[PDB]
């Protein structure tokens, strides 16, 4: 989760951590999690995506 910038003119190379760890980890957790009802929902969504 540790990422340089070089010559730092505010390069904005910092962007690739969106792949999971920075950006994806909020699926469960925001204040608060979802608590009840997210488990069969993960595999329910596999059917909305067939297109």
């Amino acid at each position: 989760i540790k990422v340089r910038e070089n010559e730092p003119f505010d390069v904005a190379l910092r962007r690739f951590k969106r792949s999971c760890e920075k950006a994806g980890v909020l699926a469960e957790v925001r204040r608060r999690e979802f608590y009840e009802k997210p488990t069969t929902e993960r595999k329910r969504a596999k059917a909305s995506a067939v297109k």
Binding site: I1, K2, F16, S19, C20, E21
Partner: protein
């Protein structure tokens, strides 16, 4: 691919987010993938396959 000397040559299947990519991209036989999965597991917990960037 059940044991050590081959998984140090197969780190190609680690996508940039630091995790093992779904085989759609080459297309491997189930027996061979399900072997390499356990070869990977022993190399994970022993840090001989040093999982993602800072570890």
């Amino acid at each position: 691919e059940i044991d050590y000397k081959d998984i140090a040559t197969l780190k190609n299947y680690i996508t940039e987010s630091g995790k093992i990519v779904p085989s759609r991209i080459t297309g491997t036989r189930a027996k061979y993938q399900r072997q390499l999965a356990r070869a990977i597991k022993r190399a994970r917990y022993l840090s001989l396959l040093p999982y993602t960037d800072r570890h």
